Amino acid sequence: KQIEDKLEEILSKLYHIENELARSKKLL
Amino acid sequence: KQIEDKLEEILSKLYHIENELARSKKLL
Amino acid sequence: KQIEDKLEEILSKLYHIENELARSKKLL
Amino acid sequence: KQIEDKLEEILSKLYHIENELARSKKLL
Question: Region entry Leucine-zipper: which residue ranges (chains A, B, C, D)?
Answer without folding.
Answer: 3-24
